[PDB]
Design an enzyme around this catalytic site. Structure first.
Site, mmCIF file in Angstrom:
data_model
loop_
_atom_site.group_PDB
_atom_site.id
_atom_site.type_symbol
_atom_site.label_atom_id
_atom_site.label_comp_id
_atom_site.label_asym_id
_atom_site.label_seq_id
_atom_site.Cartn_x
_atom_site.Cartn_y
_atom_site.Cartn_z
ATOM 1 C CB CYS A 149 -0.945 -0.022 1.206
ATOM 2 S SG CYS A 149 -2.056 1.409 1.314
ATOM 3 C CB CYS A 154 -3.804 2.557 -0.870
ATOM 4 S SG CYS A 154 -3.566 0.996 0.004
ATOM 5 C CE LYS A 157 -6.017 3.160 -5.006
ATOM 6 N NZ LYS A 157 -6.879 1.932 -5.127
ATOM 7 C CE1 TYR A 291 -8.469 -4.519 -5.732
ATOM 8 C CE2 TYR A 291 -7.564 -2.298 -5.837
ATOM 9 C CZ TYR A 291 -7.559 -3.570 -5.291
ATOM 10 O OH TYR A 291 -6.639 -3.881 -4.305
ATOM 11 C CD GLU A 295 -8.313 1.552 -7.948
ATOM 12 O OE1 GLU A 295 -7.146 1.161 -7.739
ATOM 13 O OE2 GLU A 295 -9.168 1.667 -7.027
ATOM 14 C CG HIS A 566 -29.910 21.156 -0.121
ATOM 15 N ND1 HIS A 566 -29.942 20.415 -1.286
ATOM 16 C CD2 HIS A 566 -30.327 22.401 -0.460
ATOM 17 C CE1 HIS A 566 -30.305 21.191 -2.293
ATOM 18 N NE2 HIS A 566 -30.545 22.402 -1.818
ATOM 19 C CD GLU A 571 -29.488 16.917 -0.393
ATOM 20 O OE1 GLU A 571 -30.380 17.206 0.442
ATOM 21 O OE2 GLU A 571 -28.988 17.769 -1.164
#
Ligand SMILES: Cc1cc2nc3c(=O)[nH]c(=O)nc-3n(C[C@H](O)[C@H](O)[C@H](O)COP(=O)(O)OP(=O)(O)OC[C@H]3O[C@@H](n4cnc5c(N)ncnc54)[C@H](O)[C@@H]3O)c2cc1C
Ligand SMILES: Cc1cc2nc3c(=O)[nH]c(=O)nc-3n(C[C@H](O)[C@H](O)[C@H](O)COP(=O)(O)OP(=O)(O)OC[C@H]3O[C@@H](n4cnc5c(N)ncnc54)[C@H](O)[C@@H]3O)c2cc1C
Ligand SMILES: O=S1(=O)CCN(Cc2ccco2)CC1
Ligand SMILES: O=S1(=O)CCN(Cc2ccco2)CC1
Lengths: 588, 588
Positions: A149, A154, A157, A291, A295, A566, A571
């Protein structure tokens, strides 16, 4: 019950004090241990439901029932008068360092899980070593402390993902009134890589400082378990030696796979090489559909690359396939080309990589579609993203007795114990667990607490949320829609869904009905939320909070009674009403 | 009792059908009503648990116990044979339109709550009129249908916040490898305003189209309630007349206040004027310290303005004050000047606004500090954000009997009823309630369901999440830390907190320890989460999901056992551990 917990806790804790918050004799022992720089665990009996039972059970070990009681590696050391005596007589240091092994804990592997385990254990006084070594890639790439990672996963990336998101930011800025012209701005790859690698370097450094400050011994050496308590280490000079440890944590992770075709190892690369590449990949073929594949293809395209992805069968196998298809369609509408139902047969070299002028080479890729038609096309870089695998054959002698499954992962009980009672395994090599950095960290810290501080909490591996950082991001928590229907039947499943448009996309003239969200619910269980799915910007920030509600058993009614913030994308989850069964359109 | 529910449902519904999903006679009736274009509510008795009891009580009105039974405005109409008799005799339309009033519902106010209420009521066959009128500002600003949020509130506000966010995207892009030079790029106020106003224009038109497609009568006219059932309306051409309605919903909102000092009304502006201003404000003074004031000051600075805020006492009164100070400190470090403990005395005009060349005028501001010292400075624009108030004198005749509180807001029960039994109030004028757009929409939609479809669900106004869209945003859900300490005592409160740094900020070289989060918890109640707070990018996206968990009663243990999504800012909430009582630093 209480009796078996106490014996387990006393036997494996390295240094542990039994105490009460209000006892001045316990305070005096705490002060001596502090001054002598003796780290230890502490159990405050006055703060536990059954402290009374625990206090009585101690006598089976010490023959006394008072506090404080000090133990070192399973052995009662003394009450306060005895501890003070050892201190005054210059005997305490030698007693607390007395051990049958070199280390209370040896961690094999210095990544996400292993670093987290080693640091946590040392805080309770366990004498700890972490071993880390990075086997070079086929072209020679290597990197520093921290694991997949930190160095090739991670972190780099998502930094390059951000570099790609900024390209749309530059476009959007014109419509919001800024004077730049997106058309005359270009990207410099090597400038980006310098910036990313400089942040990774500060993390490499940070972990070495963190282990030193916790008194952890760090050995940059390859480890091999040869018996339950013996780890053979090999130097960077190939010097071989043996160390011993009471507990062993295997935390060695995985590395990328290569298909067995001519030219793949010699001429292609993997994600291991990509994040420090000195030249822009250029026209690129990505082989795979995980993925990782999607990615990398995605940010390469946002940064100006001519990119193709070659897909054997489906995108994102094991994720909700309706979400996976929306992810692919968006990438295809913004540049990425797909060669669908296609596999490679060989890579041929047309040009060698130009180290001098800092330029890629050139390759010829040959393959075929599942109907037998042929594929043939030239690329400058070919990235293989076709899975990852452990290599425990290196780490682990067969005669130790640690059981593996048919994929070579370690079979563990729900407290990370292997078939060898003093040996545990965490992170990506733990069979059947989600392969993610926060999971490996949680497992390693929780395990260290049970071994050396008497904790009982287990790691919960169910309903762990995820996010795929494609150009439009995809967040999820829980079951896919097809898995929920498989498990409960169609008539027991209701799905609420809606399209949506971010407010930020309106003035920017972006698409109206591309972002998407749905809740997959179980009718017979008060319309329990079985899975949540969102395609849109900041999908990981959107999803994280809801993962707490799902962990607590949220229903559709819980989502309805909560009020929205909002204006946000998130939401929209609070006002969902269109069901898939109604056949009403979900567009806006 | 079930019987008094059924009674209120029958009296209040406009057109309602009691049915069962399996009865082909109800099906014949449903289709007849569908073909004659008759909308209505439907209660399916074979789904409610005491449908048996309800079927019994229907006989008190119809003298029959079978299904279907159709009612219109409190009166039983017939079963399947009778409904079909009216249909084939051309008598059905006249019976469903028979009413004592012109309308089943008159909504006074066409904003967030009013439009939502009116559209929901019409879905169940209620004959509905929505009234809206925008009284011009002192300088003459006016706008279209949709209310305060749509035209001069949340929507244009957040679009200009995004324009400001994009200037840091331009700075960031250089460090991520893009070739632009930020120092050579400027902003055009009027281009932004045109794009923002074109979006607002599509919303004005969308609301008129929605009302037409729901058969809602829209009158662009000022309404005044003169008796419980009579509304007097005034044309754009000054024509006065009267319409009557069964139920009335007041949803007329608020407008900004001006301080009573010389020059304020003549020479200042407010938020009503800012979002369509034809010239850039220039050097600007914002008077006040609410979320409106800090949000407007913040993006003006990000777009290149010279901006000063004048603070009477504190920032964000009524929000958590440790957090409000971090918000203001960020702004001060990024170019907003503050004049603290200061009030204005007068505004002098030095130069009139130049309508021709599209340029601001020039003003002289005179004030004083609380010690006694003086303030005097010129500014091109002065914006007042010192609060908002209703104007119900204009809307409500004193003799109708609707009780107001001492601030001028309507006193309501927990189901929005006023002291006049057929008149209700929703939104910003409902005394005591959070003044937020999603609250008004939930209140309006839920009320319409109670009046016209036999619903019972009430709006829950507790623990409603919020986000302040300052340059660094601040999201919150639940109690501030000071309110919790005062309610339960310092010894019963535990606060977990941490700084963090977004991954995106690393390569951009942004600040290490300004983003911040905390959880405020009650010890003696299983460490219940009382309040959640986060200062950082995308704070509204981050906060929203935790609001569901807080609604469900989340504890700290719930946050700990949930796993993070990596790499995100939100995941920091899943691993908090530093308590304020410990004294340990929260930095990274
Ligand atoms: C491209 C990519 C992107 C990813 N993105 C994400 C993401 O966004 N979010 C997320 O949650 N996860 C992500 N992951 C997954 C994440 O990287 C892993 O889940 C995690 O790194 C696994 O941690 P670990 O401790 O199990 O092993 P690792 O982090 O792989 O650490 C094992 C270490 O042990 C070393 N080692 C191996 N054998 C020996 C030996 N015999 N002696 C000594 N040392 C040895 C290895 O070289 C390595 O340094 C990504 C992975 C990849 C490949
Ligand atoms: C600058 C600003 C920013 C904001 N940002 C946010 C945000 O980010 N998030 C959020 O949740 N909330 C935000 N708000 C609050 C939000 O705008 C309000 O809570 C919401 O608009 C209240 O809706 P309402 O239906 O009560 O009234 P309104 O939306 O104000 O609608 C009332 C309407 O009725 C009209 N009217 C009044 N009297 C009469 C009459 N006699 N006859 C006919 N028509 C009449 C008014 O002119 C108006 O059009 C913001 C407010 C402001 C001022
Ligand atoms: O046996 S080897 O070829 C492979 C294992 N390495 C261990 C190593 C790599 C870096 C530091 O330590 C020694 C030589
Ligand atoms: O002076 S007024 O009568 C002017 C007209 N009225 C209502 C109205 C509806 C549309 C435009 O205007 C407000 C006050």
């Amino acid at each position: 019950g209480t009796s078996q917990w106490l014996r387990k806790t006393v036997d494996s804790a390295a240094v542990i004090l039994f105490s009460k918050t209000t006892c001045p004799y316990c305070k005096k022992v705490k002060d001596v241990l502090a001054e002598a720089k003796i780290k230890h665990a502490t159990i405050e009996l006055d703060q536990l439901s059954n402290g009374s039972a625990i206090q009585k059970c101690l006598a089976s070990f010490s023959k006394i029932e008072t506090v404080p009681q000090m133990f070192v590696r399973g052995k009662f050391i003394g009450d306060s008068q005895t501890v003070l005596k050892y201190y005054s007589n210059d005997e305490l240091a030698g007693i607390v360092n007395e051990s049958k092994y070199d280390y209370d804990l040896i961690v094999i592997g210095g990544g996400s899980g292993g670093l987290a385990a080693g640091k946590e254990a040392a805080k309770y006084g366990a004498k700890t070593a972490v071993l880390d070594y990075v086997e070079p890639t086929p072209i020679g790439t290597t990197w520093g402390l921290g694991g997949t990672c930190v160095n090739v996963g991670c972190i780099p990336k998502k930094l390059m993902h951000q570099a790609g998101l900024l390209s749309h930011a530059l476009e959007d800025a014109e419509h919001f009134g800024w004077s730049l012209d997106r058309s005359k701005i270009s990207h410099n790859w090597s400038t980006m890589v310098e910036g990313v690698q400089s942040h990774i370097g500060s993390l490499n450094w940070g972990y070495k400082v963190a282990l030193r400050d916790n008194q952890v011994t760090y050995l940059n050496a390859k480890g091999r378990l040869i018996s339950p308590h013996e780890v053979q280490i090999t130097d960077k000079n190939q010097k071989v030696s043996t160390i011993t440890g009471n507990k062993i944590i295997l935390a060695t992770g995985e590395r990328p796979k290569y298909p067995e075709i001519p030219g793949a190892v010699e001429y292609g690369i993997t994600s291991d090489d990509l994040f420090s590449l000195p030249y822009f990949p250029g026209k690129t073929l990505v082989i795979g559909a995980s993925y990782v594949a999607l990615e990398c293809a995605g940010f390469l395209a946002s940064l100006g690359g001519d990119v193709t992805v070659m897909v054997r069968s489906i995108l994102l196998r094991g994720f909700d396939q309706q979400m996976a298809e929306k992810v692919g369609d968006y990438m295809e509408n913004h540049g990425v080309k797909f060669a669908k139902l296609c596999v490679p047969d060989e890579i041929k070299q047309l040009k060698v990589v130009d180290t001098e002028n800092n330029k890629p080479g050139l390759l010829l890729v040959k393959g075929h579609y599942t109907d037998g038609k042929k594929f043939e096309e030239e690329f400058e870089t070919v990235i293989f993203a076709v899975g990852r695998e452990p290599q425990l054959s290196k780490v682990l002698c067969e005669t130790v007795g640690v059981k593996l499954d048919k994929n070579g992962r370690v079979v563990c009980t729900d407290d990370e114990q292997t078939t060898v009672s003093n040996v545990y395994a965490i992170g990506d090599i733990n069979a059947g667990k989600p392969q993610l950095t926060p999971v490996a960290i949680q497992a390693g810290r929780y395990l260290a607490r049970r071994l050396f501080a008497g904790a009982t909490e287990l790691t919960d591996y169910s309903n762990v949320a995820t996010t795929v950082f494609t150009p439009l991001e995809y967040g999820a928590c829980g079951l896919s829609e097809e898995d929920a229907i498989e498990k409960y039947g169609d008539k027991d499943i209701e799905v609420y869904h809606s399209n949506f448009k971010p407010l930020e996309w309106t003035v920017a003239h972006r698409e109206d009905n591309v972002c998407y969200m749905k809740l997959v619910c179980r009718k017979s269980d008060n319309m329990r939320v079985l899975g949540l799915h969102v395609l849109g910007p900041n999908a990981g920030e959107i999803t994280q909070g809801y993962a707490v509600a799902i962990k607590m058993g949220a229903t559709k009614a819980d989502f309805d009674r909560t009020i929205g913030i909002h204006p946000t994308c998130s939401e929209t989850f609070t006002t969902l009403h269109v069901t898939k069964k109604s056949g009403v359109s979900p567009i806006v």
